[PDB]
Design an enzyme around this catalytic site. Structure first.
Site, PDB file in Angstrom:
ATOM      1  CB  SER B 142      -0.840   0.141   1.297  1.00  0.00           C
ATOM      2  OG  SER B 142      -1.778   1.286   1.038  1.00  0.00           O
ATOM      3  CE1 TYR B 155      -4.677  -2.157   4.948  1.00  0.00           C
ATOM      4  CE2 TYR B 155      -3.330  -0.185   4.323  1.00  0.00           C
ATOM      5  CZ  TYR B 155      -4.053  -1.479   3.983  1.00  0.00           C
ATOM      6  OH  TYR B 155      -4.361  -1.442   2.526  1.00  0.00           O
TER       7      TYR B 155
END
Lengths: 258, 261, 262, 264
Positions: B142, B155
């Protein structure tokens, strides 16, 4: 029938080495291509025929990329012969190895001029048409040396770092449009210059001269190829890269990973 | 097609990015094993969508947090299709919360699924890849693996960690025909991301999803548009192709300019 | 009289190596310091004496940082003994060298747990007080291995990369307050743990020759061809804890002899 | 009084008659360094700026030099050598900015920004390194920007130059890594300076109708999560840290002082 069919590409400094490899791979993917060298040579017709084997329209235009008027002439020539410049590849291999203390001022200036400022001039000249047409690709050929330093390459690392900074800004200024701007960062590639330099260092210092050179920096212990750099350009020019903006595609055998 | 004959496994590929990657790999000629946490009525339909491209497509349910089921997934692939040649570590989860109140179980689950499961799958697939002399390990990270964002501590930590793992695997395989790289998407319109927008829409914008979508996107993504699952898949196909034999230990960021600014 | 005078600092894993050097330099800069080790050892009082040489208040608390309950007990102990925790240094050196294929699962988990998840727990427990008081420093001891990879260090590189990602988020969530969060990224530091790593290399490859092994170990990665010292890492922690760093937020201070520059 | 951490060291700070450069000169002098200030040309205010920096009891001098002219950079170093001694701390700071979209970016301004923000640092570093190597000690501190690590719209030349300055920093550090010379960069975000005040003045007059407080929070909130400025004193504190013995093994890196800009 191919992913770049009908697209018009200009690759600066594409008569040999990485630039020629990029021109070959763009043509192989369907693009019409304008090759460029600093001056006309007897070999130029052969180089055009080599790229033309991929069945697209190929042209050659001599222009010194340090001269803003000749950069403009290159773009105008492309527009007259093929149409608007849709894919601009800013490619410039000039290198000079020297410690900082003795680095010649004129070599410093030339590396900045060709590796960074020439890309600005060409991008400036091409962006208005790309905006009008709703599409563009600006692909800047940087280096691992644009992300990390190496000894005795101060000007080149500065210029390539600067080209990566420039890439980010152009991409941000075009982010809401069909134009993207990105950079490719190759590691060591076996360029005509490098083949001469290793063959010379091996005869004085062969596959052992090559391994010593690569092993310092490039964990793969193998060269990147000009075709691999071209394949990264084809990827950036493709529809799958419509939302790849302001980034680096590093093709370096692990150099920057460590 | 550029990947014809190659056997790929995509974890968490029953929807969203994982499904889009599986679709694009099959289009490029790969046989593909799809995976979800649990068997679903819509699994047979999903297989047929991916099978439209004429390669062999299978489904295996496996909880990627369980090392035994990760092993079962790999052995199921070896039995049905052959040795795993392309491994795409994608299964992930999200949880938005300030650090102080971030639930301990959610932290652990995010680390386990986004980072440790990739380690286990990679461990299990590398011996065969080394024996055959070819491999692609493609880790779906990401933008949050390169920068931070508020209320996404677990995350961002897990995705940063996955990028670090990618570098090491690439360096340990650098002289082989195995490469390991990461794809770093920005905002992609997925069911999960849609939920994030939904939450913002009710809290801030009176449930108006159009206003909330623009506010959500423009905070982070200069393109003011979503990245698509097809684009992430096209990056995966690029990394799996021969033009990428010397792309090792790096990130392909597909983010509309997020990390450029 | 000194730049951190009166600040209460907790340094996890501070009975040796980098953590001890950080404790020493924070105390030198005027901070009261709580030392911590996994379990009580015969040497604990001598370590307290070393840190106390700088004229501040010093305490010691044994706690296993893998156990959230003991992390909480460390914080409550500090609150009872010295006052509110104002500087938190999340420090953990644990390492295991192995190729990925044979990397033991329990060691992978231990490295993630101590090098990443323990920092999360301690940060969670300390943030409310820092917010109430309007001041704080969270200093996470990462590594060059949190910015680049190295062979045979998959779990450590993953954990240290993750700790840097965590640092960014905490910094962003506190950016409008007097609380900052940053990471220090050392290269190779002259510590007992690193000396044990070099001794393993010396026995395996250099016939027991520690000089040759040290040269090769440093030459591979660290252009300075010399160690970073624990005092230098501590000096970077003092800098981040000082007023001049009030607007340093979510970044890395890399102290590595050039490792990441190339 | 008692000796200070940089007592006895001679520093040159380019472009230090105002702004960040002046804040760095002040903090170095407060830390005990002798300091040579520099501006593009002689101005009525130079006496006042020297005396401000000299309030901290070190030797302070002023030399006018256009940093785009290699001969004037050399005259600055030779002036320092004659007046105070060998240059031991070089701070490459003189910068300039010009905001424009790429399409209309003036060619002369592009060249000027490259020349001052990058090439001048190369010239000054080239002139100072031989003496540093002979003496076995040195600090080269390059004042970059967040814009040397990320891009921003309408700042193509500045981002290119500051990125290039960071690349230069890495190479100098690597060429000196086995010596007592370090080279590092400081990367400030938005700093409260008359120059950045002008940038908000441009935004205030063009979009906010002359209002300044509304523009200030809008100006900062786009890029700088702290919603506050970095100060010239804080940038100076980063330079003192890099110049100090605790940084002997900090080489080729960036100290980012940006209120969180690059963290997101």
């Amino acid at each position: 029938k191919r992913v770049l069919s009908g697209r018009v590409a200009v690759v600066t400094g594409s008569t040999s080495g990485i630039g020629l490899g990029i021109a070959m791979r763009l043509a192989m993917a369907g693009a019409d291509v304008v090759l460029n060298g600093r001056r006309q040579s007897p070999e130029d017709s052969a180089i055009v025929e080599k790229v033309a084997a991929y069945g697209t329209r190929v042209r050659y235009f001599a222009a010194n990329m340090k001269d803003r008027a000749q950069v403009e002439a290159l773009i105008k020539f492309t527009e007259k012969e093929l149409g608007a410049v849709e894919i601009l590849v800013n490619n410039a291999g000039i290198q000079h190895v020297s410690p900082v203390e003795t680095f010649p001022s004129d070599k410093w200036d030339e590396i900045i001029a060709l590796n960074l400022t020439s890309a600005f001039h060409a991008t400036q000249l091409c962006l208005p048409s790309m905006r009008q047409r709703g599409w563009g690709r600006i692909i800047n050929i940087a280096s691992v040396q644009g992300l990390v330093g190496s000894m005795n390459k101060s000007a080149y690392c500065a210029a390539k770092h600067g080209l990566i900074g420039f890439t980010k800004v152009v991409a941000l200024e075009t982010a809401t449009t069909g134009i993207t701007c990105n950079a490719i960062c190759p590691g060591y590639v076996y360029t005509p210059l490098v083949e001469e330099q290793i063959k010379a260092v091996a005869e004085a210092k062969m596959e052992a001269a090559t391994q010593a050179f690569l092993c310092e920096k490039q964990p793969a212990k193998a060269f990147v190829t000009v075709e691999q750099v071209g394949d990264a350009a084809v990827f950036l020019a493709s529809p799958g890269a419509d939302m790849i903006r302001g980034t680096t595609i590093t093709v370096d055998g692990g150099w920057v990973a460590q």
